[PDB]
Subunit: 237 residues, 4 copies
């Protein structure tokens, strides 16, 4: 199977697979059953911002999700990504819907990764910033139901011609270039990601969520990973 | 054939195809026969720096090449890249040797491209920076004789186990992700590239040169493009 | 007197001092009487974006001003800033009102300057980005009527408690640190600035405008420079 | 007195004030008696690199110091800078010598700070990068014995016309613009700094060290702070 590290923005409480009984953010290390979660007051129809950070000095993956004028939700987990991911990865966004549904609309996405050796200063970096998505956007790999360009946004899951979100949908967008996330003899490595999103739904209990993820380069949507599996995992183990 | 825009650092005067009678820098728009050149005092065995810039307001492709303590060489050409390149491209470095030879060693390479629409501020960007090259560097497409990792450098053309450069060699490195270089309704677009290089040779007249280039995404080394064709063109038309 | 280079967004046609008979953008080199202008269709009450660029290879100061869905206004002028400005400068925004008036509200302001020598690669840079202004924002020098913090914006000229703009107002904001804009032996130098703005007015002919400017470090608002002088010049020479 | 947070690169073991018995790196929060230290194998005459990082999610100040081909030294301390520093600060480098001495030569210094509110995305940033220092470098405040420009370097402490370091010296360089390091309602704030340095000495036990520091805006060298006090503190409390 793929190898996945992710930050989930999980809108739907699947208590039969260990979710808490409320919408939540979580750190997922090789399982949908998050290693750490925090309560998240998702605001239906408002634009939110997610920030994700990591560095190899502290070996701590952290995320903060906010809406204007409200308390943020923050979650952190101590993990050494050298012990989890391959050296080269792709980074992406994923989302899903199930019985219940929501738009999984990405309005912007930026990412930076740095890798520094002990040679003097000698540091490599990748940075991208999408504030407008186009169709046929050749620097993204779209998987499943994801589309780009409608109103300049990335729609990870299916929406009808008028903006009604559909159930049983899954889609992802991966940046085209591989990213060098760690190296045996690097002095320091770090990354950060930010995205803004609009989750809107007619349902009183929207579903299923959005995730930022890091995977093996050749990662693909696992069969059946709509709904609670967020396009990331083949099962709930 | 491919579509190529390039800045050549041309070490060898091929006067039978229109080169001036001295080493030179040049702007190449769909032909090896440069649209503009400037005299270049290449310094055998020293580390040089090349800077390339362009923006869609001025529609001027410019380059400056320097060595410490010496005068720089600068060349500029008015060209609207919308009229030459496809919207999506790859960017790369190319080099060659022929009867005469030189190392075509790249010590660093950075690139930034920005594309801004009239939506408020709404600007997309790509930036990469390689100050150390690794082997099996998955964010580069290596073509021909190019290799990475030896002493942390990118060797575009063949060098023997002790650093002796070989004749009749050609090689290129392209960044893996496509780059969005223009768009129909962009307000402004720009790019810049910088690389540092070490051209060393036992020959009194080193050959053939290094180029930074922008091409169709699927560009490959044209058959026979060693020597004076710099890995870029199939012929000298 | 101060030494000023500026890009003016001039909302009011002062034909008695050489303005064209329409709102316009202009390049001002040591005089309010622009060296080059272009027609500008300012949209009362809409958010606009201004981009300004310059580099020492091309020696061309260019600006583009846009509103969503409309044609942009662009102006360019060939000038070598080594011949006009001191080596060290401050950068800022200025605005004014006169008999007629408008809000001169800055929603965001970013700036980057780079200066590279021929030492290998050896390049210095300054970048700032304000997307929210606070009061008592210690990295800005506010002059005249300019205030910060109201709704997170920079109000260059006076606005009443309800947002009504006032006449006969002038104000400026300068970044606190001096900027090294050129050097005798630099290989390349460049800068860019971007700001977003909201000019709104009850008048059918709003006045007077906004400018991005570069000045001697100790620049101050010239006496009497409300109105057509944009907070920049002591007279219309 | 001033308020100081610093990362010390302490070359001389002052065991009478709590230093360990070896050269060390340390995190100093309002005292020269570090809250955390790590052993540091300083290499006389070699160029080292220091990296310092902090973010408000994790509230952890960390530093890593390296020389090519050797193990790095790393130290970290959990501290919420909101509880220690004023909202607005200056950032700087400091160094000293005493009875024993060393060059405290800075070859490069970069810094980035970001402050993001919950307004959508709305983030402010400052970045500077000095790879060459000039004299009369107007974006630095030099204090004490610090000078700039000799061979393009920043010499924090006194060196004779031939490069012999002098005892009983202290000097600092602060970036001119204040930095907004925290805010009451920010969602996330972060900073990073990197510098490269050359500490060379004729002494078998070089002294006293270099520090990166963050202080009240109006900070000045405390009287008598040569030697073990690193230009930072008035006493060893
Ligand atoms: O979209 C929400 C949720 O919907 C579906 O799950 C619901 C139901 O169909 C299941 O039988 C029960 C028990 O597992 O859970 C729900 O009530 C699935 O599509 C699921 O993946 C998704 O999270
Ligand atoms: O590497 C320099 C140069 O070498 C070869 O060209 C030389 C010779 O072989 C040719 O007959 C003449 C006339 O075209 O030019 C040279 O002297 C080629 O490999 C060439 O592509 C290359 O530039
Ligand atoms: O704010 C617009 C304009 O208003 C004032 O100028 C007007 C008038 O008072 C002057 O007598 C005439 C002739 O110069 O021009 C205007 O109609 C001034 O405040 C001026 O600076 C400003 O641009
Ligand atoms: O530069 C090293 C060190 O030198 C001086 O301290 C030495 C000596 O003069 C003192 O009497 C003893 C006891 O405190 O310590 C040293 O051996 C001072 O300049 C000191 O600040 C500095 O670290
Ligand atoms: Ca769930
Ligand atoms: Ca040639
Ligand atoms: Ca006017
Ligand atoms: Ca000490
Ligand atoms: Mn969950
Ligand atoms: Mn040529
Ligand atoms: Mn005018
Ligand atoms: Mn100590």
């Amino acid at each position: 199977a793929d190898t996945i590290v992710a930050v989930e923005l999980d809108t739907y409480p699947n208590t039969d697979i260990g979710d808490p009984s409320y919408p939540h953010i979580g750190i997922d290390i090789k399982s949908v059953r998050s290693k750490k979660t925090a309560k998240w007051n998702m605001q239906n129809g408002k634009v939110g911002t997610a920030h994700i950070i990591y560095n190899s000095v502290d070996k701590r993956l952290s995320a903060v999700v906010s809406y204007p004028n409200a308390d943020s939700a923050t979650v952190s987990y101590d993990v050494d990504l050298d012990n989890v991911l391959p050296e080269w990865v792709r980074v992406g966004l994923s989302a899903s819907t199930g019985l219940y549904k929501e738009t999984n609309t990405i309005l912007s996405w930026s990412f930076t990764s740095k890798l520094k050796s002990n040679s003097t200063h000698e540091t490599n970096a990748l940075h991208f910033m999408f504030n407008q998505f186009s169709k046929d956007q050749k620097d993204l790999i779209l998987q499943g139901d994801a589309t780009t360009g409608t109103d300049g946004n990335l729609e990870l899951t299916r929406v009808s011609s008028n903006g009604s979100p559909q159930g049983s949908s899954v889609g992802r967008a991966l940046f085209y270039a591989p990213v060098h996330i760690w190296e045996s003899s690097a002095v320091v490595a770090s990354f950060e990601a930010t995205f803004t999103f609009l989750i809107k739904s007619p349902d009183s209990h929207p579903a299923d969520g959005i995730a930022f993820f890091i995977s093996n380069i050749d990662s693909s949507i696992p069969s059946g990973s709509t709904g609670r599996l967020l396009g990331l995992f083949p099962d709930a183990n």
